Design an enzyme around this catalytic site. Structure first.
Site: not given
Ligand SMILES: O[C@@H]1[C@@H](O)[C@H](O[C@@H]2CO[C@@H](O)[C@H](O)[C@H]2O)OC[C@H]1O
Ligand SMILES: O[C@@H]1[C@@H](O)[C@H](O)OC[C@H]1O
Ligand SMILES: O[C@@H]1[C@@H](O)[C@H](O[C@@H]2CO[C@@H](O)[C@H](O)[C@H]2O)OC[C@H]1O
Ligand SMILES: O[C@@H]1[C@@H](O)[C@H](O)OC[C@H]1O
Length: 302
Positions: A131, A172
């Site tokens: 991100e 990513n």
């Molecule tokens: O269990 C939860 C995860 O699924 C979550 O994972 C993130 C979702 O947003 C993405 O942009 C990230 O790459 C990914 O790691 O993180 C929070 C956790 O509680």
């Molecule tokens: O927090 C982020 C959320 O805003 C996005 O939608 O999915 C990726 C996450 O890391």
């Protein structure tokens, strides 16, 4: 566990894998382990490899949860995607309290190096930077950009390649689901520029956290992402609000249409364990039964 493996079927189509996110707490409960064993060929640590979990204090690493996942994956012959090295979220306070360029640079490198060398040769791909873009295509102003500047990205990737030349290095991001969206176009331009400068970015990862009806957009967005020239591109954290078979089939077809798409990773197994549970966005319901979307993908792949 389902009778037909989407991973086996995607493999028969010429792709590398169909996986899912998980971690020790998931693997030791429900029917998660069984489903991943029979239906998927790759796993991504949902949280055990992030900065808050692995280096809560500088130089004081904790690989407990991470070690569990890698070992479980190797024993069961599942591919692994490391996730994630540099990210502004879930970041220890000691990191963001650093305002010196030199210090933050070395700290970021040490973090990348330590994690990658511990599992050297056992990780298929790593999400090195996660991100880093704002919605308008500009670089997100995080502690890394603010203190180190634009160069933090080239540095992270260069450091990662040095740590484990065997892994495919990925950048990513989310909201790269429309070819007309500014973010999508910007990442393609930025990656092209970086690679031309010798930065080792092997792939672009598209989270693909969709809402109902957005699957159709991916049919155009992935090919555009692929035009950046990276060796690979992938659907890394797929889930769809409503879990409509239409959206799911569309994302799968988008990957089947793009030669550089190595595979897809769904963000979890069962709906209740999804970070977006309220929208029942996964392929298996609370009873751990396959949903129509699962069956539709299978039929589509056969
Ligand atoms: O269990 C939860 C995860 O699924 C979550 O994972 C993130 C979702 O947003 C993405 O942009 C990230 O790459 C990914 O790691 O993180 C929070 C956790 O509680
Ligand atoms: O927090 C982020 C959320 O805003 C996005 O939608 O999915 C990726 C996450 O890391
Ligand atoms: O550059 C390589 C691509 O040529 C390769 O493409 C695959 C070839 O077999 C087809 O059946 C698959 O659909 C297609 O993805 O993918 C790997 C990449 O390194
Ligand atoms: O310790 C593990 C933790 O790191 C992971 O995030 O979730 C599962 C736990 O068992």
């Amino acid at each position: 566990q389902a009778a037909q493996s989407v991973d086996q079927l995607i493999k028969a189509r010429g792709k590398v894998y169909f996986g899912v996110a998980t971690d020790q707490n998931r693997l030791t409960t429900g029917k998660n382990a069984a489903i991943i064993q029979a239906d998927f060929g790759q796993v991504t640590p949902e949280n055990s490899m992030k900065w808050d979990a692995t280096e809560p204090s500088q130089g004081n690493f904790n690989f407990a949860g991470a070690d569990y996942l890698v070992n479980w994956a190797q024993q069961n012959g599942k591919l692994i995607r490391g996730h994630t090295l540099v990210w502004h979220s879930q970041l220890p306070s000691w990191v963001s309290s650093i305002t010196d360029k030199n210090t933050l640079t070395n700290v970021m490198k040490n973090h990348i190096t330590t994690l990658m060398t511990r599992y050297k040769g056992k990780i298929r791909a790593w999400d090195v930077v996660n991100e880093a873009f704002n919605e308008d295509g500009s670089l997100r102003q995080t502690v890394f950009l603010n203190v180190i500047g634009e160069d933090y990205i080239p540095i992270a990737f260069q450091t990662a390649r040095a740590a484990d030349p065997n892994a495919k290095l990925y950048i990513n991001d989310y909201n790269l689901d429309s070819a007309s969206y500014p973010k999508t176009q910007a990442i393609v331009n930025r990656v092209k520029q970086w690679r031309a400068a010798g930065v080792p970015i092997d792939g672009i990862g598209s989270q693909t956290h969709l809402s109902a009806g957005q699957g159709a957009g991916v049919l155009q967005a992935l090919p555009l992402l692929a035009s950046a020239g990276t060796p690979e591109v992938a659907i890394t954290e797929l889930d769809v609000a409503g879990a409509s078979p239409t959206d799911y089939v569309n994302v799968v077809n988008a990957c089947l249409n793009v030669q550089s798409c190595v595979g897809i990773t769904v963000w979890g197994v069962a709906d209740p364990d999804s970070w977006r549970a309220s929208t029942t966005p996964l392929l298996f319901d609370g009873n751990f039964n396959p949903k129509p979307a699962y069956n539709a993908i299978v039929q589509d792949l056969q």
